[PDB]
Structure 1
Amino acid sequence: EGVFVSNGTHWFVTQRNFYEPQIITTHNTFVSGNCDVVIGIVNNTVYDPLQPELDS
């Protein structure tokens, strides 16, 4: 629920009617298929909040 947006260097996800940038994560997003299908896709890390917890 949101839109992907860049400030010119980083990528964030925001709600559509008020600028509120969040880090892109495995909660803020959902997967569907491989990178090759979508017209105009871009490359970024998506942060997974479990991985630093599995680091302990």
Structure 2
Amino acid sequence: FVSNGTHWFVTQRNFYEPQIITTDNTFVSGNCDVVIGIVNNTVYDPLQQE
């Protein structure tokens, strides 16, 4: 989860090539947890599809 001060995006340790957080590109276990590092941002689910 990386940001340029904004535009929080997701990429790997290969190239910047930023991507929208993209729920399918994340892993969820723990929900809003007491874990360090929550930046309180949101991710679009590709299947919102509203």
Query: Which category of TM-score, normalised to the shorter sequence, fits these structures?
Result: 0.7 to 0.9
The number of equivalent residue pairs is 50
Sequence identity percentage: 96
The structure that has the greater radius of gyration is: 1
Unaligned segments of structure 1, at least 5 residues: none
Q: Which runs of 4+ in 1 moved over 4 A?
A: none
Q: Distance in 2 between matches of 1:40 and 1:51?
A: 26
Partner secondary structure for residue 14 of structure 1: coil
Q: Distance in 1 between matches of 2:48 and 2:33?
A: 27
Root mean square deviation of aligned Cα: 1.4
From the two aligned structures, give the one with the greater strand fraction.
Answer: 1
TM-score normalised by the chain length of structure 1: 0.73
